[PDB]
Amino acid sequence: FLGFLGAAGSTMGAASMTLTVQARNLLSGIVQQQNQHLLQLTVWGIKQLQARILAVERYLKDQQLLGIWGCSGKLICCTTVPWNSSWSNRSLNDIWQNMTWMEWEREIDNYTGLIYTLIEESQNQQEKNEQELLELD
């Protein structure tokens, strides 16, 4: 409803305290008819439907990444992959309080794909195998 992007440009902590606003405003349900003209020009409705489909597809791609990372039900989840100093050398206080998520994303944008493959392969695919080998008896 209200407060969307309230913590944009602020410290990373203030942004990481209000992820629920972004989460609820990612998927906007159809604004219902205020009131005849439910049948409309074909050309006009083609844009809106394609936009809704693209939004739904992006949301389900993000949820698919969540599912293959084992973080489907949570907004924040810690992982087993260690940070490699290659991607960033700054410490915790240099990141969560001094910088914003914008410049941070640009800094790790090159490595974001490399981390994604790691998050998907190194941990969860070994975790499920060790869970099957652990609960096998």
Binding site: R90, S91, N93, D94
Partner: protein, 107 residues
């Protein structure tokens, strides 16, 4: 009111220690302490803050330790550049800095 060791000396490659104590009203245990490598003419460089970790870029040679009565700044692996004046500071998150008397390190 914040008193340091007026001077201190250490050999090359040794670890020197600078004391920093004060009154009960301004107690080291009550607040946080930051250290500065301050050549008097030049702009000072932050070396230690919040009594923990270090300033960004500072070598792991500098170390700090805060007792309930006095603070200590330890500079391992002494260098010719370390022969400068060092100042400690008592502060909170909303009260200004309170510098000490200063300490001149000889090598």
């Amino acid at each position: 009111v914040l008193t340091q060791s007026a001077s201190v000396s250490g050999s090359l490659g040794q670890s020197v220690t600078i004391s920093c104590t004060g009154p009960n009203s301004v107690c080291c245990s009550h607040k946080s302490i930051s250290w500065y490598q301050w050549p008097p003419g030049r702009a000072p460089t932050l070396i230690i803050y919040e009594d923990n970790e270090r300033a960004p870029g500072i070598s792991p040679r500098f170390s700090g330790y805060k007792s309930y009565w006095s603070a200590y700044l330890t500079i391992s692996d002494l260098r010719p550049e370390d022969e400068t004046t060092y100042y400690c500071c008592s502060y909170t998150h909303n009260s200004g800095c309170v510098f000490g008397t200063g300490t001149k390190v000889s090598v």
